[PDB]
Structure formats: structure tokens, C-alpha cells
Design a protein around this ligand. Structure first.
Ligand SMILES: CO[C@@H](CCc1nc(CO)c[nH]1)c1ccccc1
Length: 305
């Protein structure tokens, strides 16, 4: 349990351009991947078995997210839309139109009655899942929005931007509750709530990750050693074994840190391009990593701790 020993189990091939994101289904069954090749692909979490392709976006996809019940996907595309997909039928249920530029990031709230989106048009939008109508448009940032995430009860949204700010929003009213990172720069490339909704993990494009106390609005911890000057790279709370922070890197490696000691406890070697996206399995010690154009594969890693 002390230090993880993640080892390569499967390499998943199929995507013909850069992979943009990977996410495990909450029920642990599936990995979903999105790509610059305009496709979503579904894989078996435990054996990497290719299950299907999902098609309909007219341009590249930047993000994909799962509903609580593992039955829906939402995707964010350069075609300026989001799409809600029934995963079982592979059919597009709704197209979410309203953004005036690339949609970069998306997530379901835990109720999975709302979707939150971030765009190059510098706004965050909230969508009704059943009707696909836009409920609210938040003038959230003054540069592209890099990440959006709901907290554990869906009462708050956290957003991040190249404008160098991290903000938190009241879901119901869409009013700003606070501006957490108010620095002019470095650009905030990623943010998400901790599983308890108490902290916020934030990446800045100066090779730095930080853990913030949302309530107190102050930085508890700092993680470094990786390379992150250009890309919006996902980061994760690993909580099934040892308590880790997980991130990709522009040196083609996956970085794992001890959350408390801030020490590098593993570096995963295999990718041949920037590791843009990592995801942690909800019940087993498994990591999915995915990489850009020169590589285009997804790797599944497994650990005893
Ligand atoms: C090169 O940038 C990636 C962006 C990946 C990403 N990070 C976040 C953080 O919330 C969202 N999405 C990408 C974009 C489009 C096609 C392929 C790759």
C-alpha cells in the first residue's frame, strides 16, 4: 500500500489522430475515449477489448463525460456543439447549440439532469439534459475556458481559463461565489473538485499543480517535477489504494505523487507523445493514459497498491 507499482497491461489502438480525453464509467465497466478524429470509442476497462465507435460530430472532440448511471455520454467538439449519446444504442439523443466557438470541456452534475460546458467563446453554459435547451450562459472568463466540474452535491461549478483565473459558481443562480486564483497569469489549464468537494486541484502552465482549500481560499500543497507549459492536461485524485495525485506530462510520462508528502512515487514510461489525459478507475487500482498525434494510443496500467 506504501508506493504504487503500476505496470502496462494493454495498449488500445484505433484512433487516427490525437486522443483528447479518457474517462472510466462510474460502474467500472467501460473506458470512453474522445479524439481529434471526431470519434468516441468504448473499451473494456479490465481487458482493453474494443467495444464500439460512436459517430456524429463534424469536427474534432476535446472532451467526453459519463452520467451517474453509466447510460449517457456528453461530448464537446470544435463543431461548436455538445452531443448527448445513449451509450447502449450508440445514438445521438440531443445536440446542444449556443456556443459561438470550440467547446473544450464538459461534465454531468451528480443528479445528471444538467451538463456544464466550457468554450473558446469564454463562457460557461449549463444545459437541461432532458430537453437539450441552454438554461444559463455565464460570462465566466476573458479567454478560453480550459475546465469545468461540479462538486459532490452539484450545488457548485468550478471553472478555469487561460485568463489565469479559477472561479466557483452557484449552480442554481449561476452567480460567482468566489475567484480562487486571481493571478494575471500563469494560465489555469485544468481544475476539479476533490471527491469530498472540500479541495480544488488546479494546474497552471508553469509546470505546477496545487491543492486549494475551497472554503479558506488558500493553497495547501504544490506538486512539481513534470512538464506543463502548453497543454490542458487532466489531473486526478487516486483513492482506491494509496492516496495519489495523477497527471500526464509533455515529457511523454505519467506522474504519480503522494498527496500528503508531495513526493514523486511513480513515473510511467511507454507513451511516445504528450500524455494529455489520465483517469483513475472508481474501484480498482487501474489508470488509463492517452497521448497526442505521434502516439494516438491509450494505455491501461494496474497496481497492487
Ligand atoms: C491538444 O489539446 C487537447 C485538449 C484536451 C483537454 N484537456 C481538458 C481539460 O479540461 C479538456 N480537454 C485536444 C483537443 C482537441 C483534440 C485533441 C486534443
Amino acid at each position: 500500500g506504501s508506493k504504487p507499482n503500476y505496470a502496462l497491461k494493454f495498449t488500445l489502438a484505433g484512433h487516427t489522430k490525437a486522443v483528447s480525453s479518457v474517462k472510466f464509467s462510474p460502474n467500472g465497466e467501460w473506458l470512453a475515449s474522445s479524439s481529434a478524429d471526431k470519434l468516441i470509442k468504448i473499451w473494456g476497462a479490465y481487458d482493453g477489448k474494443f467495444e464500439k465507435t460512436i459517430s456524429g460530430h463534424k469536427l474534432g472532440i476535446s472532451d467526453v463525460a459519463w452520467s451517474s448511471d453509466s447510460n449517457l455520454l456528453v461530448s464537446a467538439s470544435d463543431d461548436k456543439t455538445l452531443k448527448i449519446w445513449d451509450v447502449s444504442s450508440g445514438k445521438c439523443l440531443k445536440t446542444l447549440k449556443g456556443h459561438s466557438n470550440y467547446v473544450f470541456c464538459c461534465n454531468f452534475n451528480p443528479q445528471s439532469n444538467l451538463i456544464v460546458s466550457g468554450s473558446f467563446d469564454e463562457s460557461v453554459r449549463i444545459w437541461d439534459v432532458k430537453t437539450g435547451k441552454c438554461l444559463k450562459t455565464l460570462p465566466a472568463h476573458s479567454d478560453p475556458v480550459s475546465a469545468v466540474h461540479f462538486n459532490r452535491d452539484g450545488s457548485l461549478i468550478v471553472s478555469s481559463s487561460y485568463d489565469g483565473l479559477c472561479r466557483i459558481w452557484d449552480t442554481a443562480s449561476g452567480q460567482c461565489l468566489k475567484t480562487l486564483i486571481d493571478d494575471d497569469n500563469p494560465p489555469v489549464s485544468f481544475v476539479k473538485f476533490s471527491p469530498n468537494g472540500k479541495y480544488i486541484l488546479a494546474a497552471t502552465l508553469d509546470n505546477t499543480l496545487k491543492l486549494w482549500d475551497y472554503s479558506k481560499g488558500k493553497c495547501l500543497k504544490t506538486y512539481t517535477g513534470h512538464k506543463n507549459e502548453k497543454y490542458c492536461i487532466f489531473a486526478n485524485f487516486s483513492v482506491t489504494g494509496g492516496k495519489w495525485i495523477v497527471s500526464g506530462s509533455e515529457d511523454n510520462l505519467v506522474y504519480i505523487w503522494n498527496l500528503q508528502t508531495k513526493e514523486i512515487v511513480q513515473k510511467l514510461q511507454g507513451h511516445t507523445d504528450v500524455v494529455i489525459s489520465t483517469a483513475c478507475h472508481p474501484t480498482e487500482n487501474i489508470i488509463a493514459s492517452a497521448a497526442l498525434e505521434n502516439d494516438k494510443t491509450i494505455k491501461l496500467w494496474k497496481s497492487d497498491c
